[PDB]
């Protein structure tokens, strides 16, 4: 059970040899699940089923839609979320994330229609213009795109990709205009994304349009921002600046999607609250055979720094049209969890696909299977050897509680936290047991989904005047949540982390107590 | 640096991940074998030439469909395309032929709680070949059609057999008896496709020459969320036993219709190589899809990238600690050669072998450097593709009357092959493995020599 | 350069060795217990006071010699010296008293009617061994009497017989016993005889041991070192003899012969701790094999969490000289590196000329060796080899030790009644000292058997409010640590308490700033 | 149940300790070298024959006392004893001669209870200059301590003595060693790399093949150890003087540090002084002394040394035999699984094919449990490169160079064998002849038998520097 026989192996190779398909996993699923909301999932009715299937974060993509449309999406999520608040013991917080548009390049309209398409045949000629006279009159001869300075960055012989890198063009002759030949062709539609691998796209990291959406998210009380195409640390500083004082508590997740962002990852990770490995654009900007290097590198460096990392894009792509995934997609999710990803994401599988609930359920089943097969003995040993010595009492308390949880096979680590930080410090050491973080801050409970293993619970009872009684109140609530979810039963042992006084920064007490 | 050598010198696996560098270029050699299913999209002589140039090592023919005259024509075109490069033996690549049996599949014969899936797992319990997740084995291991197909393979001189739906050791022995004495040198690769094969894997592996993780049927017979567990389990035990293991099915499925893979497909190929798979396989991507060459090229590029990212310092240590002591001189010589190749950053290990066994025992310990196996046996050269890192070369030169001179001829042939393929150049250091007398079984000599 | 912390952070043991630095000073705290045999050279109140100040934790009484009156006076002098520091509880050091039994010894008679006469034995010469009581006081270079009446039943021709702690060796030539001297030398009175490889059938607990153990219960000793333990049933016999009145006395089994090493696992299971008694052991087995048996027993005791003592000839040359040999400096250091909880002195303190110097040398070596321990490897291995458990105290103990490495704490403070909670911390071998606060004087004395436990005896009365009684004992430990230089105000320490009074309820670990 | 094989398979160091067995007998091969100081107790030819039969590999000559004529007769007696066994080349053991220099010494019975002039208890004479504490007579008296002071040595710890690296007497003694054809020099009180160079310069062209072992005996040599190690052929941990110059409770740190860095560099390290000191007067050692010898071997020392135990004491043969018995037990107790892995990890990757042949040979020897590794070598270098990786099996180094066979004793596990056959015309036949010679030596001394598997290292042409061939070969 829980691959515990493989966990006691002395080598990683023998650990693999002991992986048993008949060793059922524990109940808790530690990996967070982010879901992109769109036409197939934005109804209050479907959203309620997204939550029951395991969605923790509803993602809103501001590459498309108006502020009024997204405001309605946010309302439906919160409506579906609060529809379960009648039972505070089974209530699951749900976070809202805003994915900025960023320096996107998009084509124009095919023959004045949003749905029209033309067939590009390989080897044929195709002209690219910036003259807005063709902005709505693109066809197989001429194509308009919205990057005015595309000629200052594209040398002759360059390659241009259109529509998620499916169409590829080679610039055969530069103009004032661009004369290209189609390498790989096919159906060319309207408003398609363009990638220029190996070109210094001078488009601003934070456009005037992005400024409005960021301030929109601050007004809407979003829990986090996914910032697209972050190339350097100063790009992160603009995002932090625009969010200003009122958006101080909004977590900033930098998306790495090009060569420069990979090269500058350290300065970007230092300034950010988290990372997203956005493999979609990344797979086009750099060779597709190198993406897995960038992913393992970014996940490991984030695990080392104790900052959240998200694995995103095309994880269960085939499930947009089919109710079951391919074998490659099953192993991709599992290996991302084995790599150490805090969260796994879904895009078109939930935004527009035909089986959005099956996708969420499949991600939940695989992640719980992958979490049991993790070789904890080596991971915990390596995280401690790579983590520096600390003078923070909470840090020493966190590593001691994780070590104690491996020793007594505890059902959970219960943590009282106001800002989340205490639970974050436990999570970075990757215990096997789920981390039940008890909080009264709703925003804290929603941002805890970015961390592996943190199962946030929001206590709704009023603050008791006697502080030692307020602590016991929240601890017993955690015991009720854990017993109701089947994390443990009466008589089991659990780790409880508390402070010596109210307020953030005083977590310093670890207790080993039986389940009431 | 190159070949992820900065990540290679890390003291922990986590720090090894942190040092992976997309700007660190891999070496020229690609160690993982590429098995391509040949079908209507790829059975022309002109196409097969491009597939070989793209890196195809093994042509798989799926006997679930097609007549013997059809398959015999496919085999013939495969050998025409293969032998079209024989005029230059420095650059000639052996290409193997594999026969994949139909096996005991239920289609919509019969002699049949709940649970019963149909049409590749498209109905049960509802939904839009037939599988019985967790059921008895009514049909025989080797039916009468399989016997004729297996006998046809011996006649067409195939190098290996992929036996479908192996459930126990006696299934393997049944196949072996059918190949008989005329096909006793044909390698039997047991395909693990159901819960029974996973439960009885150790007895199946012991009876087999190798294993295929056939994830297609496996993902229907057992929960889909468990396939990664059984895959890593079987690759691990095959690595421990030193037997070849193939990862198969839906690795680049979307490339049937599209010229570039998804992100999940790109990481699936890489992680299979990182797991330790000797070979990776393409099915519909090469048999029926619109982009057969691109799929072969993509497996080549990913595999070479992932091989540079292997954490050899942990893998080599753990492979030795788990391997038993030996009295076989070839086994001791082989592990000494691999240790020496790491010590001097060798450009290759050159192995002279008649049956391939000497090269197989080197591949067992997973050197970073390519293993140039020099043989005069054509079947040995073709069967070498089943093993990670073995780059076979077929020596066509006549035997020299002085045995020491004949050894030097074959060694110098491997040197010219290595130079022409960019594995190494003049002045580099290589490991050379030979014996003290002619004949198989006497490999016991390791020499550390500069490339002339 | 401090605490060999540069060597502490190595990735291999070889690199750890390469980084050991003679210019990197150790900390104040010395973790290895020091046991001293008290004798003529050291039994005065004046000398005992200086030995306590020099670092002695345990006074060993060797009941192979002396009367009950003699030992009663020694014990009185030990307690006089100890309690002379009892007026400052912050600085008072508990001192344990250990009784070392005679056990099934074999001794010779008197040389020419004198307990101080001595003859000379020559190589190849013949020596007659008799059991006739007419010679028990009439021994000389021709006839030797010994008190083992069954010796002819257990020896044969060619057997080796060793006399006076292995100095002289004989070989039986005829069966009274006719022998030929192999190695000669001066033969005194009442010397010990070893019969290596013979099946000696003496009782585990003799009538003399019965009287000495009863004396031990009346005199309130803290532990018994039981000589020549051969099997678990020997340990049980000692436990039954001590009975109800001696149930709290710790029983340390001395492993000194071949059967003891062979049956070590069952003996360890029955005992509270182990002494590697290398003196007799090096005569009973080949001396080139002693180091193997020592490292085996220390390893298995560390694995089981039970105290192990390394004993005998650690600083033998300091009996006559003020400074040890290089081999002796190495032996003490390697015993601490092996994992020994305590190191022992015998003749160096019982009868030598430099008893204070010997105690001070062991203190200096042990503290240097403790800094050199490769804690990264040791802590990882003790955890891997320890089973998962449902005991909250064990999980709390391993979390506290892990926390102490994380924040480089100056100490782990533990409140314990019986000692058990501190013993469970010591089993995981933290670098930081373990300050065990107890109100039980016997718990305080017995804690010296465990590496790193620094016991302090709280004298303050019990507070009615239990949370105040707890805070009182924690602050007392804070004052002890500051007064002894383990830490200072602003540092971080680990505190271990329980949720309710009484033994067995330790479940609370706190990371606390030093006020 | 043999050679601590059960403990050898443990997955942790702790479990390795827990599995050590006193009932697990070692092999016959003893890998650690034994160096004996020759003096009035061991000077006679008949005594030296027994010391050789008991395990002495190197005879040490202490040039702090005695005359050139005295030491010359000592050398003649050693060579007389050594060559008395030469009638059988199969069983002959080479014996090396080492010269130990006096070096920068400061020397002076009355009583003293708690006035230096540069012979009574009121004014003492010393031969030195200016410059705190001063130690006299093996550090027993401190200046403050007391004792029976009676031409005793003086130590000035921490200080910087103005005495030259080599003295006029040492120059004469070094030139004497050159004339007497000694195999190695133990250079006393080496403080810096320049001191090693001045010694190497004194030995000149005629003494260029003489191995220089630097003795580390004070604080400065410990701090400048890396530069001294690089310039030297090897290191001696001279714990006698070192234990006076630095606090005695720190000697074990310096010893373990210097053995580790020598093992890491692949250079010989000798642990010396007071290892069996009580055996000067007693036929058996103390428990601390048996532990000290064994822990020196477990630390990784290539050689162990006897001083007064063989030079002046009553039981020299017993002392040599005890070091032999302890060393053999401790070598079986080595945790090879960890040691070999760590040695490889800290060793650099190079292009020298001899080094790559050496690791591959050691790895192969662990895989097939070989009875030996046979190395053909003319300078010793190829055998030294095998020994740095510490195989469990013995290294039979077959040479025709008699100085090489004697110098090989400085390296753990190298069993030197001197071939005296004429050089055969065919190269391949001259190699086969020397290999077969090692097979016979192995069978004679019980290292292996017919049908066993051994590792054989050879090269591709005559002369030194060409070892590149490893073979796994059945014993004939
Ligand atoms: O993780 P954070 O943000 O530091 O908060 C943890 C805090 O929660 C507590 O357990 C309770 O604090 P509050 O009563 O103010 O909510 C404190 O003891 C502790 O300092
Ligand atoms: O791997 P195999 O089949 O054992 O072959 C190894 C043999 O090949 C050899 O190169 C000799 O082969 P040949 O008999 O063709 O000359 C020897 O080195 C060795 O004994
Ligand atoms: O180590 P022991 O013998 O279990 O004693 C530890 C006990 O001491 C306590 O801290 C309290 O001690 P008191 O009973 O003297 O107040 C308990 O919480 C705990 O169970
Ligand atoms: O260890 P060294 O000094 O390099 O000598 C090893 C030499 O021994 C040999 O095996 C034999 O050389 P020789 O003919 O000089 O004895 C050479 O191949 C090799 O170069
Ligand atoms: O047969 C296969 O290859 C499969 O089912 O995966
Ligand atoms: K006694
Ligand atoms: Mg993008
Ligand atoms: Mg000296």
DSSP line for A143-211: EEBS-TTTTTT--TT-EEEETTTTEEEEEEEE---EEEEEEE-EEE-SS-BEE-TT------SS-HHHH
CA of B242 to the centre of ligand 5 (A): 23
CB pairs under 8 A between B and D: 102
Number of CB atoms found within 10 A of residue D2's CB: 11
Listed residue (A311, A304, A263) closest to A450, CA to CA: A311
A511: closest chain C residue by CA: C508
On whether any CB of chain B is under 8 Å from the CB of D476, the answer is: no
Rounded to whole angstroms, the Cα distance separating D468 from D458 reads 7
On whether any CB of chain C is under 8 Å from the CB of A403, the answer is: yes
Ramachandran region, residue D396 (left: φ > 0; alpha: ψ -120 to 50; beta: rest): beta
Rounded to whole angstroms, the Cα distance separating A405 from A402 reads 5
CA of B255 to the centre of ligand 5 (A): 18
Contact C260, C268 (CB under 8 A): no
* Atom 12 of ligand 4, nearest CA residue: D462
Candidates D102, D107, D169, D224; catalytic one: D107
On whether any CB of chain C is under 8 Å from the CB of A511, the answer is: yes
Ligand closest to the CA atom of residue C326: 8
Burial class of residue B417 (count of CB atoms within 10 Å of its CB; 0-12, 13-18, 19+): buried
Helical (H) or strand (E) element with A334: helix A327-339
Approach to solving: X-ray
Q: Which of D139, D261, D283 sits opposite C323 (nearest CB)?
A: D139
Helical (H) or strand (E) element with D457: strand D453-459
Question: B68: which residues sit within 8 A by CB, 6+ positions away?
Answer: B148, B149, B152
Please give all residues whose beta carbon lies within 6 A of any atom in ligand 4, as ranges: D 376-379, 381-382, 458-459, 462-467
Q: Which two tokens stand for residue A59?
A: 């993602």
Q: Which two tokens stand for residue B408?
A: 């030097």
Burial class of residue A123 (count of CB atoms within 10 Å of its CB; 0-12, 13-18, 19+): exposed
* Least Cα separation, residue A244 to chain B (angstroms): 32
Map tokens 């994830």 to a residue: B215
Tell me how far CA of residue D4 lies from CA of D21, D333, D335, D336, in angstroms.
7, 6, 9, 11
Largest CA distance in chain D: 77
Question: A194: which residues sit within 8 A by CB, 6+ positions away?
Answer: A105, A106, A107, A145, A147, A160, A161, A162
All partners of chain D with 3 or more CB pairs under 8 angstroms: B, C
CA of D241 to the centre of ligand 8 (A): 5
Listed residue (C400, C356, C402, C358) closest to C508, CA to CA: C400
Strand C58-62 relative to strand C96-100: parallel, antiparallel, unpaired? parallel
Listed residue (D175, D187, D211, D179) closest to D407, CA to CA: D211
On whether any CB of chain D is under 8 Å from the CB of B403, the answer is: no
On whether any CB of chain A is under 8 Å from the CB of B84, the answer is: no
Strand partners, C36: C59, C345
CA of A416 to the centre of ligand 1 (A): 6
Contact C80, C45 (CB under 8 A): yes
* Least Cα separation, residue B281 to chain A (angstroms): 12
- Dihedral sign computed on CA atoms, order A478, A483, A485, A487: positive
Rounded to whole angstroms, the Cα distance separating A187 from C3 reads 70
Helical (H) or strand (E) element with D186: strand D184-187
Residues in chain A: 516
Rounded to whole angstroms, the Cα distance separating B262 from A330 reads 13
On whether any CB of chain D is under 8 Å from the CB of B1, the answer is: no
3-state SS class at C161: strand
Rounded to whole angstroms, the Cα distance separating B230 from B247 reads 11
Burial class of residue D270 (count of CB atoms within 10 Å of its CB; 0-12, 13-18, 19+): buried
Helical (H) or strand (E) element with A4: helix A4-7
Candidates D191, D211, D215, D412; catalytic one: D215
Rounded to whole angstroms, the Cα distance separating B38 from B349 reads 32
Rounded to whole angstroms, the Cα distance separating B414 from B369 reads 14
Query: Annotated binding site of A for ATP, which residues?
Result: 61-64, 106, 192
Residues in chain C: 515
Largest CA distance in chain B: 73
Rounded to whole angstroms, the Cα distance separating A77 from A60 reads 11
Rounded to whole angstroms, the Cα distance separating A360 from A353 reads 12
Rounded to whole angstroms, the Cα distance separating C496 from C297 reads 30
Listed residue (B382, B298, B292, B392) closest to B46, CA to CA: B292
Strand A178-184 relative to strand A186-188: parallel, antiparallel, unpaired? unpaired
Contact C421, C393 (CB under 8 A): yes
Tell me how far CA of residue D46 lies from CA of C334, D51, D78, in angstroms.
38, 9, 10
Listed residue (B130, B123, B82) closest to B104, CA to CA: B130
Half-sphere exposure of D195 (CA within 13 A, CB side): 28
Three-state helix/strand/coil letters over chain B = CCCCHHHHCCCCHHHHHHCCCCCCCCCCCCCCEEEEECCCCCCCHHHHHHHHHHCCCEEEEECCCCCHHHHHHHHHHHHHHHHCCCCCCCCCCCCEEEEECCCCCECCCCCCCCCCEECCCCCCCCCCCEECCCCCCCCCCCCHHHHHHHHHHHHCCCCEEEECCCCCHHHHHHHHHHHCCCCCCCEEEEEECCHHHHHCHHHHHHHCCEEEEEHHHHHHHCCHHHHHHHHHHHHHHHHHHCCCEEEECCCCHHHHCCCCCCHHHHHHHHHHHHHCCCEEEECHHHHCCCCHHHHHHHHHHHHHHHHHCCCHHHHHHHHHHHCCCCCCHHHHHHHHHHHHHHHCCCCCEEEECCCCHHHHHHHCCCCCCCEEEEECCHHHHHHHHHCCCEEEEECCCCCCCCHHHHHHHHHHHHHHHHHHCCCCCCCCEEEEEEECCCCCCCEEEEEEEECC
Listed residue (A130, A154, A124, A153) closest to A143, CA to CA: A130
Rounded to whole angstroms, the Cα distance separating D412 from D390 reads 8
Question: C480: which residues sit within 8 A by CB, 6+ positions away?
Answer: C90, C435, C456, C486
Rounded to whole angstroms, the Cα distance separating A467 from B112 reads 67
Helix pair angle (C355-371, C326-338), 10° resolution: 50
> DSSP alpha helices (H): ranges in C339-461?
347-350, 355-371, 375-384, 392-406, 420-426, 441-446
Phi and psi at residue B114, in whole multiples of 5°? -155, -140
Which domains does chain C show, CATH number per domain?
1-29+370-515 (3.40.1380.20), 30-103+204-369 (3.20.20.60), 104-203 (2.40.33.10)
3-state SS class at A297: helix
Q: Which two tokens stand for residue A12?
A: 């990683």
D246: closest chain C residue by CA: C22
The reply to whether D215 belongs to the active site is yes
Q: Which two tokens stand for residue C118?
A: 């001595």
Q: Which two tokens stand for residue D294?
A: 């064994």
Number of CB atoms found within 10 A of residue B87's CB: 8
Listed residue (B74, B129, B126, B122) closest to B107, CA to CA: B129
Rounded to whole angstroms, the Cα distance separating D56 from B451 reads 46
Map tokens 């190198």 to a residue: A290
Phi and psi at residue A457, in whole multiples of 5°? -125, 135
- Dihedral sign computed on CA atoms, order B410, B416, B419, B423: negative
Q: b or e along D205-214 (b: 16 or more beta carbons within 10 Å of the residue's beta carbon)?
A: eebeebbbbb
Rounded to whole angstroms, the Cα distance separating C52 from A323 reads 79
Task: Give the DSSP letter of residue C179.
Answer: E
User: What's the distance, Cα to Cα, between the start and end of chain B in Å?
Assistant: 26
CB contact under 8 A, D350 and B327: no
Helix pair angle (D336-346, D353-368), 10° resolution: 160
Strand partners, B59: B36, B97
Contact B317, B287 (CB under 8 A): no
B317: closest chain D residue by CA: D341
3-state SS class at D390: coil
Give me the torsion for CA of B429, B434, B436, B440, rounded to 10°: 170
* Atom 1 of ligand 5, nearest CA residue: B214
Rounded to whole angstroms, the Cα distance separating B450 from C8 reads 42
Question: D201: which residues sit within 8 A by CB, 6+ positions away?
Answer: none
Rounded to whole angstroms, the Cα distance separating A4 from A15 reads 10
Q: Tell me which chain D residues have a C-beta less than 8 angstroms from the C-beta of B326.
A: 367-368
* Least Cα separation, residue D367 to chain B (angstroms): 5
The CA-CA-CA angle for residues C492, C412, C424, to 5°, reads 150
CA of D381, closest atom in ligand 4: 1
Contact C111, C117 (CB under 8 A): yes
Q: Tell me which chain D residues have a C-beta less than 8 angstroms from the C-beta of C333.
A: 249, 252
- Dihedral sign computed on CA atoms, order A199, A204, A206, A208: negative
Burial class of residue A211 (count of CB atoms within 10 Å of its CB; 0-12, 13-18, 19+): middle
Q: Which two tokens stand for residue B367?
A: 């050197």
Ligand closest to the CA atom of residue C350: 6
Q: Which two tokens stand for residue A497?
A: 């982390």
Sheet holding C143-145, edge to edge: C143-145, C126-130, C177-183, C168-174, C160-163, C193-194
Q: Tell me which chain D residues have a C-beta less than 8 angstroms from the C-beta of B314.
A: none
Number of CB atoms found within 10 A of residue A152's CB: 11
CB contact under 8 A, A362 and B252: no
Helix pair angle (D68-83, D168-180), 10° resolution: 30
Helical (H) or strand (E) element with D291: helix D287-299
CA of B432 to the centre of ligand 4 (A): 20
Ligand closest to the CA atom of residue A284: 7
CA of C223 to the centre of ligand 6 (A): 13
Rounded to whole angstroms, the Cα distance separating B367 from B31 reads 10
Query: Does ligand 2 lie within 6 Å of residue B355's CB atom?
Result: yes
Question: D464: which residues sit within 8 A by CB, 6+ positions away?
Answer: D377, D378, D379, D381, D382
Rounded to whole angstroms, the Cα distance separating A236 from A254 reads 7
Three-state helix/strand/coil letters over D99-145 = EECCCCCCECCCCECCCEECCECCEEECCCCCCCCCEECCCCEECCC
Q: What share of chain A is helix, strand, coil (3-state, %, to 5)?
A: 40, 20, 40
| DSSP count for chain C of H helices, then E strands | 19, 21
Phi and psi at residue B266, in whole multiples of 5°? -65, -35
Listed residue (A294, A286, A289, A287) closest to A312, CA to CA: A294
Strand partners, A269: none
Strand partners, C250: C223
Number of CB atoms found within 10 A of residue D140's CB: 17
Burial class of residue A208 (count of CB atoms within 10 Å of its CB; 0-12, 13-18, 19+): exposed
On whether any CB of chain C is under 8 Å from the CB of D145, the answer is: yes
On whether any CB of chain A is under 8 Å from the CB of C14, the answer is: no
D107 marked as binding residue = yes
Contact B411, B447 (CB under 8 A): no
């Amino acid at each position: 059970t829980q691959q515990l026989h493989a966990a006691m192996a002395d080598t990683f190779l023998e650990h693999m040899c002991r992986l048993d398909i008949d060793s059922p996993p524990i109940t808790a699923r530690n990996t967070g699940i982010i879901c992109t909301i769109g036409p197939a999932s934005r109804s209050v009715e479907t959203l309620k089923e997204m939550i029951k299937s395991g969605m923790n974060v509803a993602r809103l993509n501001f590459s498309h839609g108006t502020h009024e449309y997204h405001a309605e999406t946010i309302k439906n999520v919160r409506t579906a979320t609060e529809s379960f608040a009648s039972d505070p013991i089974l209530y699951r917080p749900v976070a809202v994330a805003l994915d900025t548009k960023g320096p996107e390049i998009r084509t124009g309209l095919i023959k004045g229609s949003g749905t029209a398409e033309v067939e590009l045949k390989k080897g044929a000629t195709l002209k690219i213009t910036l003259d807005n006279a063709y902005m709505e009159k693109c066809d197989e001869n001429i194509l308009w795109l919205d990057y005015k300075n595309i000629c200052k960055v594209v040398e002759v012989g360059s390659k241009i990709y259109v529509d998620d890198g499916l169409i590829s063009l080679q610039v055969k002759q530069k103009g004032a205009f661009l004369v290209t030949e189609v390498e790989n062709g096919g159906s060319l539609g309207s408003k398609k994304g363009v990638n220029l691998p190996g070109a210094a796209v001078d488009l601003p990291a934070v456009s005037e349009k992005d400024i409005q959406d960021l301030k929109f998210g601050v007004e809407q009380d979003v829990d986090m921002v996914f910032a697209s195409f972050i190339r350097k640390a100063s790009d992160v500083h603009e995002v932090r600046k625009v969010l200003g004082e009122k958006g101080k508590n909004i977590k900033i997740i930098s998306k790495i999607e090009n060569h420069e962002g990979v090269r500058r990852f350290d300065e970007i990770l230092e300034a950010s609250d988290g990372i997203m490995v956005a493999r979609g654009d990344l797979g086009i900007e750099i060779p597709a055979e190198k993406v897995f290097l960038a992913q393992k590198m970014m996940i490991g460096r984030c695990n080392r720094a104790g900052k959240p990392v998200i694995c995103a894009t095309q994880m269960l792509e085939s499930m947009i049209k089919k109710p079951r995934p391919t074998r490659a997609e099953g192993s991709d999710v599992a290996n991302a969890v084995l790599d150490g990803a805090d969260c796994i994401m879904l895009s078109g599988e939930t935004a527009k696909g035909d089986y959005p609930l099956e996708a969420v359920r499949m991600q939940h089943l695989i992640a719980r299977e992958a979490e049991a097969a993790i070789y904890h003995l080596q991971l915990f040993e390596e995280l401690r050897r790579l983590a520096p010595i600390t003078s923070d009492p909470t840090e020493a308390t966190a590593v001691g509680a994780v070590e104690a949880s491996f020793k007594c096979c505890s059902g959970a680590i219960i943590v009282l936290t106001k800002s989340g930080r205490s639970a974050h410090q436990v999570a970075r050491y990757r215990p096997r047991a789920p981390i039940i973080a008890v909080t009264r801050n709703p925003q804290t409970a929603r941002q805890a989904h970015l961390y592996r293993g943190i199962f946030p619970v929001l206590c709704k009872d009023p603050v008791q005047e006697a502080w030692a009684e307020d602590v016991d109140l929240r601890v017993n609530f955690a015991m009720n949540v854990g017993k109701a979810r089947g994390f443990f039963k009466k008589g089991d042992v659990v780790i409880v982390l508390t402070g010596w006084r109210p307020g953030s920064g005083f977590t310093n007490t670890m207790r080993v107590v039986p389940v009431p």
